[PDB]
């Protein structure tokens, strides 16, 4: 029943299957890192991410006069075995919390089914996997074996609080925007969280509040998983598409813009900043990309490798994209089924909806200002549970989000930095 069937310990001996040393296709060299496969198609690497981007391998903080407003550095974080063990347990716990809700189960199911499309071959008659959608696993005999995967959760790079969902690009194909999809790497940490203010006028003001309430890390991870969903089905909105924030005088005076991809991901009223015309443009655009995939599958007659048959993969993608098949064995995209899937991934899976499911207090909009970053420890059950997060039932933290109240539940939060006023 649990999303993660085994309670991994960082020091568990490697087995070359679900506990192994691996290398990622960063187009560069790297020493293998210990990784854990927590569920079909999903791996966790308890390391700071100095791998996905070669230009971001230094964790040391730049000079104090060169650091930005909202940022937090600690070159030593996640460097010890005890930390990696806690990281692993914290991340698995958040996956369980997410999976325990119907929405999370739906999202995670969609993610597992969202296998990156096999469009790496130059011959339109043959289907071939794109190697950057795989990782290289060291087997018991010391040799490497290629394994396809959909998601990797890895520690943050230099700036500990800069969580994000990234993936390896293609020389010509825009994998996260052409319906293909690609393996997603989420920079994330369950050992820190952010503060926000309960009053909207305060939360959206850069000069007020210290961050009285703490964001539930499960929402934060879910937010990243939502991006992953968009990217795995190749329907992420181009980051150049932004909303000129004109509903907040403080954003305006700085010309701050926010991508539609972020507004969509948050959901709620934020999503309404993307007008009907533009929303239609995107929907039709991705509908066509799905059509191209359906045709590519029709033009397929061969397949590379023996890890599966042409017929097996054609079906695996028929399932992912929910395609239809006529008597002649041809695939096509059904408008109803497409709109349903597209809407599921973009409107049903949103931060705002996860808040409703977790029954937690959370920022009301993405268009606010950061307040502070806290150090936390969600692994101990006396601190945080799969079922209630910080608001432990049958305790003084059960009601009114008392568990997220950093003033009431002060023993669970250590403020590391305040961001208010620095903007
Ligand atoms: Zn985001």
From Swiss-Prot:
Which residues take part in binding Zn(2+)? 223, 227, 262
Q: Where is this site: Transition state stabilizer?
A: 363, 366
Mod. after translation: Has slow autocatalytic activity, cleaves 250-Tyr-Tyr-251, 266-Phe-Gly-267, 419-Phe-Thr-420, 423-Phe-Glu-424, 430-Cys-Val-431, 432-Arg-Gly-433, 438-Lys-Thr-439, and probably 429-Leu-Cys-430 over a period of 4 weeks. Catalysis of the '197-Gln-|-Arg-198' bond in SNAP25 is estimated to be 10(5) more efficient than autocatalysis, leaving the physiological importance of autocatalysis in doubt.
Effect the entry attributes to changing residue 363 to A/H/K: Wild-type KM for SNAP25, about 75-fold decrease in kcat, no effect on Zn(2+) binding
- The residues annotated as the active site are 224 (proton acceptor)
* Compartment(s) of residence: Secreted; Host cytoplasm, Host cytosol
The consequence of residue 227 to Y is: Light chain no longer cleaves SNAP25, not toxic in vitro or in vivo when reconstituted with heavy chain
* Phenotypic consequence of residue 224 to Q: Light chain no longer cleaves SNAP25, no effect on substrate or Zn(2+) binding
Summary of the function given for this chain in its UniProt record: Has proteolytic activity. After translocation into the eukaryotic host cytosol LC hydrolyzes the '197-Gln-|-Arg-198' bond in SNAP25, blocking neurotransmitter release. Recognizes the '146-Met--Gly-155' region of SNAP25, which confers substrate specificity. Hydrolyzes the '202-Thr-|-Arg-203' bond of mouse SNAP23, but not in human which has a different sequence. Reduction of the interchain disulfide bond occurs in the host cytosol and probably prevents retrotranslocation into the synaptic vesicle.
Domain text: Has protease activity.
**The name this protein goes by in its record:** Botulinum neurotoxin A light chain
- Organism, by scientific name, is Clostridium botulinum
Q: Which gene encodes it?
A: botA
Q: Which residues of the full protein are shown?
A: 1 to 423 of 1296
């Amino acid at each position: 029943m649990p999303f993660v069937n085994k309670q991994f310990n960082y020091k568990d001996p490697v087995n070359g299957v679900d506990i192994a040393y691996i290398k990622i296709p960063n187009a560069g060299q790297m020493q293998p890192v210990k990784a854990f496969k927590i569920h079909n198609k999903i791996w966790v690497i308890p390391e700071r991410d100095t791998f996905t981007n070669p230009e971001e391998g230094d964790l040391n903080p730049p000079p104090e006069a060169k650091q930005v407003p909202v940022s937090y550095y600690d070159s030593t974080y996640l460097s010890t075995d005890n930390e990696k063990d806690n990281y692993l347990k914290g991340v698995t716990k958040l996956f369980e919390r997410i999976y325990s809700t119907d929405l999370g189960r739906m999202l995670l199911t969609s993610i597992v089914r969202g296998i990156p499309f096999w469009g790496g071959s130059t011959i339109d008659t043959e289907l071939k996997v794109i190697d950057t959608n795989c990782i290289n696993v060291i087997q018991p005999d010391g040799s490497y074996r290629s394994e396809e995967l959909n998601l990797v959760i890895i520690g943050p790079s230099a700036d500990i609080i800069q969580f994000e969902c990234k993936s390896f690009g293609h020389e010509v194909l825009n994998l996260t925007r052409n319906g293909y999809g690609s393996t997603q790497y989420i920079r994330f940490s369950p050992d820190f969280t952010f503060g926000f203010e309960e009053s909207l006028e305060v939360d959206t003001n850069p000069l007020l509040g210290a961050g009285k309430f703490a964001t539930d890390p499960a929402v934060t991870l879910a937010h990243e998983l939502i991006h992953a969903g968009h990217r795995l089905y190749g329907i992420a909105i181009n980051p150049n598409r932004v909303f000129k924030v004109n509903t907040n005088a403080y954003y305006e005076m700085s010309g701050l813009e926010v991508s539609f991809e972020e507004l969509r991901t948050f959901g709620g009223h934020d999503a309404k900043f993307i007008d009907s015309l533009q929303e239609n443009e995107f929907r039709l655009y991705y509908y066509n990309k799905f059509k191209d995939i359906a045709s590519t599958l029709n033009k397929a007659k061969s397949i590379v490798g023996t890890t599966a048959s042409l017929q097996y993969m054609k079906n695996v993608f028929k399932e992912k994209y929910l395609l239809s098949e006529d008597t002649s064995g041809k695939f096509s995209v059904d408008k109803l089924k497409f709109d349903k899937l597209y809407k599921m991934l973009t409107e049903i899976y949103t931060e705002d909806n996860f808040v409703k499911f977790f029954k937690v207090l959370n920022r009301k909009t993405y268009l606010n200002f950061d307040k502070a970053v806290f150090k936390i420890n969600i692994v101990p059950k006396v601190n945080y549970t799969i079922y209630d997060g910080f608001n432990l039932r049958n305790t003084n933290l059960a009601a009114n989000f008392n568990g997220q109240n950093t003033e009431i539940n002060n023993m669970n939060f250590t403020k590391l930095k305040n961001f208010t006023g620095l903007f």
